[PDB]
């Protein structure tokens, strides 16, 4: 309207508007949420907004000079790339907590197969 | 025929199971499987030797509070897979593919609760559903087109709560809460044309919907059989078996004994009451009897769990004695029964969510 | 003395009868069993020609963890089984709707064991074998038996189906048939006159009771100019004898004068009364000279054609509306002082008596339409439109109280012409013409099924008529008890005598919901002698907007049935 | 129970079973 | 398959996201004007003219849209929208029901792949076709109501292609020069300045075959009448120049992106600046003087950028529409500036608006002239929404 | 008559 | 908020199935003469025993014609009889029951048609 | 309970000059 | 109201909202800094007189500053292999995402064969070396995402160049860990040349009191709303599946969270698609006809101040 009174947001009893998010999709969400919590510990160690990564040493490096380094591999796998850290990094960076926003946007889609999906994955046109 | 109790299940939801059907389309050698519908739950079971019963599958309508009280089995003629149609209080039909484990079709349009489902004996794709909306709808499950609607000005004036194809699928005898039994012929010219046009329809190449046939006028109607709610009806060949609140399953026939079912007129106003089956303690309604595939035995249960099995192969089943099978642990009202295709096993369901297995000999 | 013998014979005959019945049901059961065996055999053979894939158990694959658990226990030694329970995909439910039938016009409808077979068996069994003692005995012991005099009369009678059968008392088959015997004109036309309803031209009227006055009513016989003209070689004139016969009215030959031809000649002469040329032309099995000969023979047999007619001398320049207004003012000041009620219209016929205070329509406070047999210039009749524009204004008489434009009376407004076209200019001939607006059915707000409008409609525009089945008020209360217990009523009050029920029949407009602030209003209009309910737009309605109209319920009833007002911040 | 570590009550309802991270928030009995 | 189940769950969550955005619409926009076209539109470009009736609290604008149908006839429609010129509004916020009306429709020989108007003569509109030819239409020579007979004769047709095309742009300086690109590796040119004797058919004048892959949209230089860019599936941007006496070697050629490049837009307010967008989820902008060097790239889209358009009335503001059901508007005056941690959490400083109002691929979009900040975005799900970002987001 | 259940 | 057009999914009144957008354009699904009414009039005519076969057929065809065309006025029955002759006239000759229709015409006793209309209808039937 | 409609309105008075 | 019903009714929206937490934290739906009621986010002003004639100058200066490394030669000489037999080494390259294939094209090139004596003894040699070539050209670097090498005696993949084409391997002795495909180790050397409370209500019979520390953050999506008004607005708008009532509390706030029974969780897309049969529904295989509708859900909001009186 121009300036007249607007309609109320609620009344006595209106017909049900249905719910598109059914219990089948909700069961899918619950399964995927339990899987994501078991893998990433988002709601336990990640403070709800971060996913934790556990580092395992793959390669041990000793350089030409008097320095050594270790290769880090992360438990959730491809969500984070392998990096090289010095010997002193052990027992100080065993588990790193990375915010959901700081995760690499190309590999953050591998965390969960519903984070983003190209809906018409099969395209009849361009 | 003598039956014995070998198994007595009990579902966890503790809600009445108003329906149970053996999969009569399974071949010989593959195991016996049946489905029991009750509350919002649909379950599949398997029958093995020596009383062994195995819960195979289970489906639930977790939203909108569906009360399943019907089931019916069929197969996919193209791909040979089984299909189970379920319906209930919401008036929606759900064709379930038990091997792919998902509901593959819904059919909304019944104006009220559906309390019976029948599949055409000569056509798996044709499904019949009666409902509280005073009408019967014949659905096609190949193409999701409603072939016909049975009701209207001369249809049932109250809840249609049972129907049955004749054993060759040429007619349907429907019974409702109006104490009336009505006959609808599918072998008519217009109904065959309706099936044919339902098979060759696809919305993607036409701008018009499928022209469903509205059949207001049945080929027969009678209120002379029962004086109360007639809650079950089956075809004993050409003689119609009908059940109501009065403790008797009445075997009757349209017209006089000289006339045949093919030549009765829509205006015929007389019936022959040629027999009745006497039982007791089954006053409450929506209790359903079900003869076996060969129509040689007829089973029914009463409010106290006494399962009356009659022998329809006797010369005169009118005076024949029943078998009144019972178990001391039963007592809840038997809702529906089903025999195997060979009728070697008889199953039953009760109001306390229990399944009882009886084996012939 | 005769008691025990009659009792013994009655028991033995009834024993034979029910033994025969038992044998018949045995034979029927055996034949039905044979049919069952044959058909089940062919079905079983059909079932063996394919293969069905066996269903296997289910395990949690999709939604591996977090699903519900389904279990079944056993009273016996069998172990308890547990399997994952899977949820079926949700399906969009639909609102409840009981069965109803389409209707674009009203549909008037009306409001221990015992059988007759045992009485017939008693009559025929005892009738085969004075005999009054048997009836007296069978009435003496049995409390339920009696009327021995009728039994004795039946015994004296043939006690057999000696009646003519399906033939009526006056057998008048199709005239084109081979046994169409000659009968009187009223006898041949009796069915049409009794069954045809003039109010809506339907044989066996769907909304008017057949208990109405037949075609035997006063009418003018001046249907033609009676112009004299020769017919041809055979004619009612141009011959000396033919001319003499024509002059006398105003030798016969042994022609093939069939009974059908004679009956049809009688029928045509009972409607034309003056011209044998047309009658000869219409009947192909007749010669015009022979036509005149048979007419002369019939006139000498019973009577000639009277051909009585009237001219209605009185007339005036304003003999239609001013005295109409005076008569209406008189009837309103004497009895029709208020509009608290409205009666159903029924045509009144009199033996030349005038439509005084004893007239059923005048005492019903209704104007006589063209269906009344009042008079050609009945002062109580409604004259029609003189308006030369749109008839949606409160200044036109027909629209004024609540009435539509009669298509044979309102001539200038345009309710007569373009009968086969939607393009009309009267705007008050809509509900008669069925000029309904396209409506869509969809699950509405407030309630379940509601009606919606496709294209926008301005205010005071017509929307589909509220059709239904016309019932009585007592039947209305009867079925409305059940409807009220179901909390869903389609009853629309039409007048003080009848009421429209849209439950079992109707049109799309039956789904229009209720609202204290509606976009539509309903008025009961007099449409060609019939009260019909038209739905009109109270304001301009947008496309796709839901239609509401006030039910005018009592406050308690409105609150308890349709109390959902759709709004909470209106003030 | 009124205490919540970060969102603990909402994190109880989602993985209510399946031996998930609810083992560390048993205080919400 | 599991793919169908994931698609179903994605549909549910996408609907929930649309509900959340629709709930949050008033605080992100100062105009959202939705419409569900009866058939999805692959093209969206505002006509330059604007009508401002006296005393009316709105103005009339027009669109160049299309209908890409399933089986029935395809039309080149021109819409008419009403926008709230005043601060009050546009019953409703203006006319009771008049907000969007489609009164222009010309029958098409296939779906409207691309539809662009001639800047020197907006009445004539060139359009691409899934067929091998490119057709031009003058909506002043065709009836407002389409002829239901069938195909409609265009003003004329342009050949020189062998299969479907997507690239199209008119010359903003030379009146009568058109560019098109197709799935053939060839970019063609036509002289439409004067073809009276062409007989409804105009053949190609010069064909540029430099690329070796699917050539995507080609856009002329805004201020220079002889240069035009080109992007293709060859993962390279090559900038061309006419009157060069050649058809295969362009003026420049640089590997634009790591994937197929399908976008091109020269900045109207800058002589040497263009921006490209590719399937690598990045938007890149170059400089004409230093083609060898790519001096920025925007990383916020999720699947694939399909349309990049420069905002008129603003030199430093760019918009890209992707398959991620998001239309991004980039204020590249904020490139690489400091931000608070929760500020940086939302995205790069170059981002100042994500359009989350579409639940499908945004097929095309176009800023409108004569209104500083109004965009029209069309998607494959029939939903076309004219929207304006909130005022306080900029300035 | 009525009373679907016991 | 604001809306303009059809905001919801519509259904068929007779089947309660969803209404496709292609189905609204050229179909209102409500005709003046439903088939159930035609069958009802046929059964009701045959329910009467006094009327002969020719009378039954005459009332059959006349009722069907009137329901199809929906005549409501007295002045439109000359053309109604003409249209009955043109449309159903071939059925009368096939039934060979023309005498009982000409008998139906004489209607005239109800002052609905003219005698000239009767003559014209009988002439047109032949 | 029955749905109702408003009643009649009346009939025109005879026309007469002032 | 049973407690289990309360738990189910409050876990139905919690599940979806916490899934949306992750989904929109990785793939945003809109920028919360652009919402009118979190104007505190994006503190940087919009004032700018930016010019396009200095972009190239700045970029060239930055590139010249950053142009530090542009370097670019080994033989296999296989040796033993630590372990508590033949081997081959492959240079495996990963291409870039293409339309043709949904996965990153991965390819390796053979460069020789090796024999590795298992578990060599200390000082028993009489650490292997790598093999390198001109396989890292910038023209090829544009094509491929990154460079890597693979071992197999049991696999071990090693990356030489990062995603930014930055060298990460240097001259030194490496010891990788084998995979099943400490423990099995391959050794080699090479050189390269307000305390806010929440209350949960259900049918006025089940009640739960929850005080959430890290307050002013959204419990459902951990969104940081530094103002209480902003938090309440975010809850009511983004999380409308509940009904929130703000009640004043000493030294904080009280929010009465209850289920929104009137939430319009219907399918906002095509109305017809919700009644299609499974499989055919939500096909997205092409165009669909639908009746046109026009929605004006924003025309000109009044843009009032951040008044706490909006919630009572
Ligand atoms: Zn009548
Ligand atoms: Zn009267
Ligand atoms: Zn009168
Ligand atoms: Zn009278
Ligand atoms: Zn008038
Ligand atoms: Zn009038
Ligand atoms: Zn008029």
Author numbering:
A (entry chain P): 170 to 295
B (entry chain A): 80 to 440
C (entry chain C): 14 to 124, 164 to 181, 219 to 339, 426 to 746
D (entry chain F): 138 to 166
E (entry chain N): 4 to 93, 106 to 410
F (entry chain B): 1 to 6
G (entry chain L): 556 to 661, 663 to 682
H (entry chain I): 25 to 42
Sentences from the paper on this structure:
To investigate how H3K4me3 inhibits PRC2 function, we obtained a 3-Å-resolution structure of PRC2 in the absence of JARID2K116me3 and bound to an H3K4me3-modified nucleosome. Overall, this complex resembles other PRC2–nucleosome structures, in which the H3 tail is clearly visible entering the active site and H3K27 is positioned for catalysis. Not surprisingly, given the absence of JARID2K116me3 as an allosteric activator, there is no density for the SRM and the SBD is in an extended conformation, both indicative of an unstimulated state. However, we do observe a methylated lysine bound to the aromatic cage of EED. We propose that this density corresponds to the H3K4me3 modification, the only source of methylated peptide in the sample. Indeed, the resolution of the PRC2AJ119–450–H3K4me3 structure allowed us to confidently build a peptide into the unassigned density with a sequence matching that of the N terminus of the H3 tail that agrees with a previous crystal structure of EED bound to an H3K4me3-containing peptide49. Our study shows that histone H3K4me3 interacts with the aromatic cage in a similar manner to other EED-binding peptides and is further stabilized by interactions between histone residue H3T6 and the hydrophobic pocket defined by I363, Q382 and A412 of EED. Additionally, histone H3R2, the only positively charged residue that is N terminal to histone H3K4me3, sterically clashes with the SANT activation loop (SAL) in EZH2 that is required for stimulation through EED7; as a consequence, density for the SAL is absent in our PRC2AJ119–H3K4me3 structure. Overall, the absence of contacts observed between residues around histone H3K4me3 and EZH2 explain why, in spite of its ability to engage with the aromatic cage of EED, there is a failure to stabilize the SRM for stimulation of EZH2 activity as seen for other EED binders that have been characterized as allosteric activators. Unlike H3K27me3, JARID2 K116me3 or PALI1 K1241me3, all of which allosterically stimulate PRC2, we show here that the engagement of H3K4me3 with EED is unique in that it fails to stabilize the SRM helix and stimulate PRC2 activity.
